[PDB]
Amino acid sequence: SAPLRILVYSDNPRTREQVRLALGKRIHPELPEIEYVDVATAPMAISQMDAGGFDLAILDGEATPAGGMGVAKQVKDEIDDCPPILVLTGRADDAWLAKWSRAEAAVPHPIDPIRLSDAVVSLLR
Amino acid sequence: GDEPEIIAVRRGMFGNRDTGDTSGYGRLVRPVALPGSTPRPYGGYFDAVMDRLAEVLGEERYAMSIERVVVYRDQLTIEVSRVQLPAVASVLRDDPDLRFELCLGVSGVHYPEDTGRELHAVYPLMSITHNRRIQLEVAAPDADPHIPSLYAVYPTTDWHERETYDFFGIIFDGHPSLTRIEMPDDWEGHPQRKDYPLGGIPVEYHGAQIPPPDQRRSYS
Amino acid sequence: FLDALAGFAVTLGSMFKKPITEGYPEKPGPVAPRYHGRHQLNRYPDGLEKCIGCELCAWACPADAIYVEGADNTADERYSPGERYGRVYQINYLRCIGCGLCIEACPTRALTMTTEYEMADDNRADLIWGKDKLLAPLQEGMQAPPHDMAPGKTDDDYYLGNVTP
Amino acid sequence: AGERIVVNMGPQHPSTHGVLRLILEIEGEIITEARCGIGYLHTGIEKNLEYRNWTQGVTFVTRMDYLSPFFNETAYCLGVEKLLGITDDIPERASVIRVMLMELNRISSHLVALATGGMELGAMSAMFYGFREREEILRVFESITGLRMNHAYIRPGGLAADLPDDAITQVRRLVEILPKRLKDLEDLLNENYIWKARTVGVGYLDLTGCMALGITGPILRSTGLPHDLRKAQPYCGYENYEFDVITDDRCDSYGRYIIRVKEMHESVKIVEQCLARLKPGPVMISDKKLAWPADLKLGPDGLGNSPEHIAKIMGRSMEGLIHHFKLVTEGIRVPPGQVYVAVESPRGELGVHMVSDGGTRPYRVHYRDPSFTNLQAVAATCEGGMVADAIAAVASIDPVMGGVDR
Amino acid sequence: GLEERLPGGILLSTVETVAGYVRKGSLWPATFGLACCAIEMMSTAGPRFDIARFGMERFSATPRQADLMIVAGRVSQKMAPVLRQIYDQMVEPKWVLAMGVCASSGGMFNNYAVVQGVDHVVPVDIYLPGCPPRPEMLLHAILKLHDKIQQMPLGVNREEAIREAEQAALAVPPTIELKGLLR
Amino acid sequence: VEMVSLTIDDHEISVPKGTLLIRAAELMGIQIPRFCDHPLLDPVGACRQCLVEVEGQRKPMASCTTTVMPDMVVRTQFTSEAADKAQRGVMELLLINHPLDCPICDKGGECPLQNQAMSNGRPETRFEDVKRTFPKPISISSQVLLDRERCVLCARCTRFSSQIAGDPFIDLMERGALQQVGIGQDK
Ligand SMILES: CC(C)=CCC/C(C)=C\CC/C(C)=C/CC/C(C)=C\CC/C(C)=C/CC/C(C)=C/CC/C(C)=C/CC/C(C)=C/CC/C(C)=C/CC1=C(C)C(=O)c2ccccc2C1=O
Ligand code: SF4
Ligand code: SF4
Ligand code: SF4
Ligand code: SF4
Ligand code: FES
């Protein structure tokens, strides 16, 4: 199998750590191994997405210089055959914007490990 | 009716919304009543306005329509019973002695503790000809938040019935199209209802953050 | 009939009058003395911080733009007269609305608002100004804040204004 | 039928103020249907008010209808005072300064309206001259309040602080120069053939239309009806001022523009009257239980509570300290009740429905903003005309979208 | 563009510096404004100040000609899609100035209706405090953006700068962990 | 249970026999200022803040100690000038020696004294003399600091430590203006 590569985007290193903690090397033993590419800045995330080869992108809607929802909209408008996007929302009322970002799934802060894992499995399945 | 309208029951000294910081001060029970029915000799031209409204409306119709009359801070409010709102609005607009042609809008206010009357719609009416003004108040339960739309009588209430709907869910039955005007149509909930959370985020600081004011302690 | 052309006479005239633009940034214009510029944490003449950390400024802020944490003025390290001083004091200038309720709230005048306004950053965090960035510069005759109160003086003396360098 | 496009004037458009969305069905270039799309500048100010005390929600209300800050503040403070039963206890100086600032703000708001309308209609220099006059007005506002916009200077029970010693001289200079400088702006537009051709007969709305939509302000008074909340239902002591309600009979865009231009001069006259009647005295109610305890003063360290007030509260007066602490932290408690208070904002009847539940925070604060109601006239004043006429009609409505959405 | 294919010698450095000088000047703002911050932006364009001195008087009506998007006011939920559409319909290089507290962090309006900073939807280059920022503050922020634009790299230098900025950013702790002196 | 009718101000209610006037006012929604009263502590009537006017009584009656009696007529500060004067004088006397510590006081914002001085106190001080002073704060245990200057000597702490908890290790000490809650010695 091919290590599924997941892009974790957040200016906050602790959000990236939590995302990587919820999703281990294997979300389930039936699923392939997972390799994480951490990106703290929007330019790096966009360039990585352009390089392709990602199975999922987790974008923090609370990212300081460039929010995850904006990056999600940008990638789904700029990359052809871009992978499913999961957005982390800083509040419940952000749900509407999460829908606008066209992200395949939205997980509110604080990141529930189990909710995030279930959403990731659903997106990769 | 005829009793004071309690919109909230405040218990405990110092406006504590919960158990309270200092022991022994929480036993007070002070109902929060809005001003009640005014004694009949209303002030200024309010007496003339009400006499004319009771003359144009039949005694039976007047009693069925006007639920209450309040004169607070030299301002006249008429608690108009739901259902009867279009009739009294037509009478107020058309009656030459009343002639309240200018309706300034509709304002929604939510009283989650006012049983059977949680949602109030306020209609500020002004008569330029007589240089008078009044307010109508129409109450509706949270269970059946329906009010008769005044679109036929006061077209200006259009968008107001919408804003008030968008922010409270009052249905204003009969409105040509009661669609959200402020919030997106996909929006869930009615923001200005007291039960709708403020929806803020913590304010970020170095090493700390301040939750939104709705989460933090308050005294009223 | 020439009235319809009055506008021309306006513009042409202004073309020969000196432009009224302020020369910012080279020659910045004069702001009002009362302008609501950057908050500033002030000191007493001897150098002690005025801020007692009462949090009234933060209390009154409509935008929750001030974070304050008080602490005891232990004899080993005193920063302000009295029992309390504000050891952590942060203003989130991306939430500040310049209303001035904070200064009107202060009971010590520890917080003022200067006329300085030039302030901007490419980073959100950099605009959360801490105690170090807000404290007024140590003037002549002042001493480092961690020092004992002026000899033969008490908090009431500081508030009454009976202290000197 | 199938030969007409449907286009979005959209939020981002020079004449739509960035948040207004006119959806126009154009048959060629004639507006056939004109839907109005609102809420792109919704802010939750009305709900967010409910989580702040009185004297704090002032800072919120001044930011809806931000071109008329003093009008929002005055409406809010009048509502609070009426709920308190304090309207008759406000100091005379505070009321006079309120009238003076409201009229200067009327001049400023009309200047912005004229500037943006001229810019939308191609009158490039109109914007610059209007903003040149508004610059002097805003200098006065900044000196009085320390802010250029969204002032929180008018407070429940009076003002945030007394005028600075130089304020009266600056306002007198304004009274002297505003007519002369407004002469330049009027010369660009008033009698200009293109300006009149571009606005005369455009956006017509009869008095019947104004009543039906509940229009107010210059739009209504362009129909010849001299309705003004300052004469009818006087407030802040406007009854003591000799001024004429400006009204025209054209019922179109040019009539509204002329009404605004003449209202500027009427405001100048009212400000001259205010200066004549301005006398030394307190600017906040004498009741210490409600009076704002802060006493701002300037010093070498900036603006802050005056050293005398610091001495009083921290040195000698326990009652003074308690009052300062509480009135600053929790603020006043307003007896429960409802009050609808209206003022004549530059754009019409700015109404405020204020409900208190007896607590330290406004239970409910709704602004009937005149722009919200006036925008209901876009369909009447745009359908049938060209898009160029729609621009002029909307500009004549002079909608400030902050008040529209709130 | 071919300017991004140039070798990293002195040629690329000079192209970078001249492009930065050219773009810092003639930095046309988009004809875009949400609230009172828009009024202060107009005042900055007004005679008392002169945005024009900086080559920035042409407020591009269409985003195609716009180079800088001064948000200049509060961004509501319903407006964020529109603002993002306007941003995407500008042509690179683009810069976003978050004028005012509302545009930068939501300001005093911390509630459901406001986005809490336009950076939630568009990359922000400079944050400008104030409510509203006085025109001098706007000019200061604009000059700061000019300084940023002048030092903007290109081509291989741009890629190296992106990598270095990423490396630096991955290490910075969050603001919630700067507990300096907090009890 | 026996029930007694009663009139507070102009209003009339019925309450169980043995009820205190302050409790009846609480049930009726009348806010009588109080410091020493505590529902769960036996009434002591010390602070004299809860004074009300009772028909047939020459002196003001401490509502926290006066049991309701049938047909009794009570007028609080809301409807009796004498009662209001008594309460405001008691508040003034309560504040003359109080420290100007509200900004630094932990109880600030949550202080019954602040609230009841706002609602029942003079707007400004008449006290131009020297305030009584103590060394502050002093620890009475590893957990509890005591600021004797802010103490209104309501004895709620001592009355709790005696009645509710059987641990009277604090008590009122000294006499007169020097009286203070204390532990006596290092214990
Ligand atoms: C190929 C090649 C390289 C050849 C070699 C030779 C060579 C180099 C080229 C040859 C020369 C060439 C071709 C040069 C290129 C440049 C060129 C051709 C031209 C471009 C430059 C140019 C056209 C200059 C002049 C343009 C000009 C007159 C500009 C002035 C425009 C003005 C007056 C702008 C001010 C507008 C303004 C006030 C902005 C505010 C906008 C706001 C606030 C928006 C939002 C908003 C609005 C809109 C409200 O009105 C409003 C009203 C009330 C409440 C709220 C609001 C609100 O929110
Ligand atoms: S700045 Fe002033 S109000 Fe804020 S904590 Fe310090 S002394 Fe108190
Ligand atoms: S100016 Fe107003 S918003 Fe800004 S920190 Fe001071 S009180 Fe808070
Ligand atoms: S930051 Fe202040 S001036 Fe700018 S849009 Fe927000 S409230 Fe208005
Ligand atoms: S320490 Fe005891 S006696 Fe003194 S105020 Fe507190 S509870 Fe009352
Ligand atoms: S509470 Fe009754 S005398 Fe103190």
Coordinates of N, CA and C in Angstrom, one line a residue, chain D residues 303-381:
Chain D
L303 N -3.6 61.7 28.4 CA -5.0 61.9 28.8 C -5.3 60.8 29.8
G304 N -5.9 61.2 31.0 CA -6.2 60.2 32.0 C -7.0 60.9 33.1
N305 N -7.4 60.1 34.1 CA -8.2 60.6 35.2 C -7.5 61.7 35.9
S306 N -8.2 62.8 36.1 CA -7.5 64.0 36.7 C -6.9 63.7 38.0
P307 N -5.7 64.3 38.3 CA -5.1 64.1 39.6 C -6.0 64.4 40.8
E308 N -6.9 65.4 40.6 CA -7.8 65.7 41.7 C -8.8 64.6 42.0
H309 N -9.3 64.0 40.9 CA -10.2 62.8 41.1 C -9.5 61.7 41.7
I310 N -8.2 61.4 41.2 CA -7.4 60.4 41.9 C -7.3 60.6 43.3
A311 N -7.0 61.8 43.7 CA -6.8 62.1 45.1 C -8.1 61.9 45.9
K312 N -9.3 62.3 45.3 CA -10.5 62.2 46.0 C -10.9 60.7 46.2
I313 N -10.7 59.9 45.2 CA -11.2 58.5 45.3 C -10.2 57.6 46.0
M314 N -8.9 57.8 45.8 CA -7.9 56.9 46.4 C -7.3 57.4 47.7
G315 N -7.6 58.7 48.1 CA -7.0 59.3 49.3 C -8.0 59.6 50.4
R316 N -9.2 60.1 50.1 CA -10.0 60.6 51.2 C -11.5 60.1 51.2
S317 N -12.1 59.8 50.0 CA -13.5 59.6 49.9 C -13.7 58.1 49.7
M318 N -14.2 57.4 50.7 CA -14.6 56.0 50.6 C -15.8 55.9 49.7
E319 N -16.8 56.7 50.0 CA -18.0 56.7 49.1 C -17.7 57.1 47.7
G320 N -16.8 58.0 47.5 CA -16.3 58.4 46.2 C -15.7 57.2 45.5
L321 N -14.8 56.5 46.2 CA -14.1 55.3 45.6 C -15.1 54.2 45.2
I322 N -16.1 54.0 46.1 CA -17.1 52.9 45.8 C -17.9 53.3 44.6
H323 N -18.3 54.6 44.5 CA -19.1 55.0 43.4 C -18.3 54.9 42.1
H324 N -17.0 55.4 42.1 CA -16.2 55.3 40.9 C -16.1 53.8 40.5
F325 N -15.7 53.0 41.4 CA -15.5 51.5 41.1 C -16.8 50.9 40.5
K326 N -17.9 51.1 41.2 CA -19.1 50.5 40.7 C -19.6 51.1 39.4
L327 N -19.7 52.4 39.3 CA -20.2 53.0 38.1 C -19.3 52.7 36.9
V328 N -18.1 52.4 37.1 CA -17.2 52.1 36.0 C -17.3 50.7 35.7
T329 N -17.4 49.8 36.7 CA -17.4 48.3 36.4 C -18.7 47.8 36.0
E330 N -19.7 47.9 36.9 CA -21.0 47.4 36.5 C -21.8 48.5 35.8
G331 N -21.7 49.7 36.2 CA -22.4 50.8 35.6 C -23.8 51.0 36.3
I332 N -24.5 51.9 35.8 CA -25.8 52.2 36.4 C -26.8 51.0 36.2
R333 N -27.8 51.0 37.0 CA -29.0 50.1 36.8 C -30.1 50.9 36.4
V334 N -30.7 50.5 35.3 CA -31.8 51.2 34.6 C -33.1 50.5 35.0
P335 N -34.1 51.2 35.6 CA -35.4 50.6 36.0 C -36.0 49.9 34.8
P336 N -36.6 48.7 35.0 CA -37.2 48.0 33.9 C -38.3 48.8 33.2
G337 N -38.3 48.6 31.9 CA -39.3 49.3 31.1 C -38.9 49.4 29.6
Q338 N -39.8 49.8 28.8 CA -39.6 50.0 27.4 C -39.7 51.5 27.1
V339 N -38.9 51.9 26.1 CA -39.0 53.3 25.7 C -38.6 53.4 24.2
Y340 N -39.4 54.0 23.4 CA -39.0 54.3 22.0 C -38.7 55.8 21.9
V341 N -37.5 56.1 21.5 CA -37.0 57.4 21.4 C -36.4 57.7 20.0
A342 N -36.9 58.8 19.4 CA -36.5 59.0 18.0 C -35.8 60.4 17.9
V343 N -34.9 60.5 17.0 CA -34.2 61.7 16.7 C -34.2 61.9 15.2
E344 N -33.9 63.1 14.7 CA -33.8 63.4 13.3 C -32.3 63.3 12.9
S345 N -32.0 62.1 12.5 CA -30.6 61.8 12.0 C -30.6 62.4 10.6
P346 N -29.4 62.6 10.0 CA -29.3 63.3 8.7 C -30.1 62.5 7.7
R347 N -30.3 61.2 7.8 CA -31.0 60.4 6.9 C -32.5 60.1 7.2
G348 N -33.0 60.8 8.3 CA -34.4 60.6 8.7 C -34.6 60.2 10.1
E349 N -35.7 59.6 10.4 CA -36.0 59.3 11.8 C -35.2 58.1 12.3
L350 N -34.2 58.4 13.1 CA -33.4 57.3 13.8 C -34.1 57.0 15.1
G351 N -34.8 55.9 15.1 CA -35.5 55.5 16.3 C -34.8 54.4 17.1
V352 N -35.0 54.3 18.4 CA -34.3 53.4 19.3 C -35.4 52.8 20.2
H353 N -35.6 51.5 20.1 CA -36.5 50.8 21.0 C -35.5 50.2 22.1
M354 N -35.7 50.7 23.3 CA -34.8 50.3 24.4 C -35.6 49.7 25.5
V355 N -35.3 48.4 25.8 CA -35.9 47.7 26.9 C -34.9 47.3 27.9
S356 N -35.2 47.7 29.2 CA -34.4 47.3 30.3 C -35.2 46.3 31.2
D357 N -34.5 45.3 31.7 CA -35.0 44.4 32.6 C -34.5 44.6 34.0
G358 N -34.2 45.9 34.3 CA -33.8 46.3 35.7 C -32.3 46.0 35.9
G359 N -31.6 45.5 35.0 CA -30.2 45.1 35.2 C -29.2 46.2 34.7
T360 N -28.0 45.9 34.9 CA -26.9 46.8 34.5 C -26.6 46.7 33.0
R361 N -27.3 45.9 32.2 CA -27.1 45.8 30.8 C -28.4 46.0 30.1
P362 N -28.3 46.6 28.9 CA -29.6 46.7 28.1 C -30.2 45.4 27.7
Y363 N -31.4 45.1 28.2 CA -32.0 43.9 27.9 C -32.2 43.8 26.4
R364 N -32.7 44.8 25.7 CA -32.8 44.8 24.3 C -32.7 46.2 23.7
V365 N -31.9 46.4 22.7 CA -31.7 47.7 22.0 C -31.8 47.5 20.5
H366 N -32.9 48.0 20.0 CA -33.1 47.9 18.5 C -33.0 49.3 17.9
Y367 N -32.3 49.5 16.9 CA -32.2 50.7 16.1 C -33.1 50.6 14.9
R368 N -34.2 51.3 14.8 CA -34.8 51.6 13.6 C -34.0 52.7 12.9
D369 N -33.1 52.2 12.0 CA -32.2 53.1 11.3 C -32.9 53.6 10.0
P370 N -32.8 54.9 9.8 CA -33.6 55.5 8.6 C -33.1 54.9 7.3
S371 N -31.8 54.5 7.2 CA -31.3 53.9 6.0 C -32.0 52.6 5.7
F372 N -32.2 51.8 6.7 CA -32.9 50.5 6.5 C -34.3 50.7 5.8
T373 N -35.0 51.7 6.3 CA -36.3 51.9 5.7 C -36.2 52.6 4.4
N374 N -35.3 53.5 4.2 CA -35.1 54.2 3.0 C -34.8 53.3 1.8
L375 N -34.0 52.3 2.1 CA -33.5 51.4 1.0 C -34.7 50.6 0.4
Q376 N -35.9 50.6 1.1 CA -37.1 50.1 0.5 C -37.6 50.9 -0.6
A377 N -37.0 52.1 -0.8 CA -37.4 53.0 -1.9 C -36.5 52.8 -3.1
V378 N -35.6 51.9 -3.1 CA -34.7 51.7 -4.2 C -35.5 51.1 -5.4
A379 N -36.4 50.2 -5.1 CA -37.3 49.7 -6.2 C -38.1 50.8 -6.8
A380 N -38.7 51.7 -6.0 CA -39.5 52.7 -6.6 C -38.7 53.7 -7.4
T381 N -37.5 54.1 -6.8 CA -36.7 55.1 -7.4 C -35.7 54.6 -8.5

